[PDB]
Write a protein that binds this ligand. Structure first.
Ligand SMILES: NS(=O)(=O)c1ccc(Cl)s1
Ligand code: NA
Ligand code: NA
Ligand SMILES: [Zn+2]
Length: 258
């Protein structure tokens, strides 16, 4: 037994090994757009990715991670709701078996085909491992994907997936520019939450962009050819690797835009 996204190990089972799954600040949530309040004290988001150094791409049996050098302030997120500098460590996606599902956050109950998470840690805590012991340790930039026209800046990711088909495979992945994954607008919603995979730690300031990016049907079809299993094991397609919306509890979602 190990956690996953199947009938016997999926989100309804996670609380048995990770009791915080039933906690007070779990993610994702539904973003009810009429209940979210504009906050004039929020700042524009500052995304500084010009000096990013990607290193490697890894199939971890749950998703694929594109990893970055986080030993200096090379790719950072400031401003917005944040009171510090947050360094990019990795990005990954969640996606569906069908175009009508796959996102973790929803917007007025609408599901997108996929969701991109750019994961950053607060530099005042020194390393990612210490940051995930803190209530303000992480900031995750979430971006919705809809199916339509292709996203050119995603294609290098699509094309390497053949070399990391199965759990545990990694490949060199240098000189990837994450600026190619952003929409035009940086307008956002924000709320306090958690990692959406075990260990489900309640360390995250979520920043979810209002504008989706559009990717082609062929791009998301290639995500769906990945495998949850290892090489030489029975093939189980890596699809529907999303957690559903969780109770909002005593939280307020704020909007950067009126
Ligand atoms: N899915 S997420 O909350 O971005 C996340 C899961 C594990 C991480 Cl490390 S970051
Ligand atoms: Na509100
Ligand atoms: Na270094
Ligand atoms: Zn995620």
């Amino acid at each position: 037994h190990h956690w996953g996204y199947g009938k016997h190990n999926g989100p309804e089972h996670w609380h048995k090994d990770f009791p915080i799954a039933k906690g007070e600040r779990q993610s994702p949530v539904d973003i009810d757009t009429h209940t979210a309040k504009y906050d004039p004290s929020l700042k524009p988001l500052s995304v500084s990715y010009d000096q990013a150094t990607s290193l490697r791409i890894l199939n971890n049996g749950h998703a694929f991670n594109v990893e970055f050098d986080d030993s200096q302030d090379k790719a950072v997120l400031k401003g917005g709701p944040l009171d510090g500098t947050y360094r990019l460590i990795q990005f990954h996606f969640h996606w569906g078996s069908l175009d009508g599902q796959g996102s973790e956050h929803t917007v007025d109950k609408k599901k997108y085909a996929a969701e991109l998470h750019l994961v950053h840690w607060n530099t005042k805590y020194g390393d990612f491992g210490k940051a995930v012991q803190q209530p303000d340790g992480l900031a995750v930039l979430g971006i919705f994907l809809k199916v339509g026209s292709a996203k050119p800046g995603l294609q290098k990711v699509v094309d390497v997936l053949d070399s990391i088909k199965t759990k545990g495979k990694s490949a060199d992945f240098t000189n990837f520019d994450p600026r190619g994954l952003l929409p035009e607008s940086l307008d956002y919603w924000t709320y306090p939450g958690s990692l959406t995979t075990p260990p489900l730690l309640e360390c995250v300031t979520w920043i979810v962009l209002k504008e989706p990016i559009s990717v082609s049907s062929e791009q998301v079809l290639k995500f769906r050819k990945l495998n949850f299993n290892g090489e030489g094991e029975p093939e189980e397609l890596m699809v529907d690797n999303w957690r559903p919306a969780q109770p909002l509890k005593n939280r307020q979602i704020k909007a950067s835009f009126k």
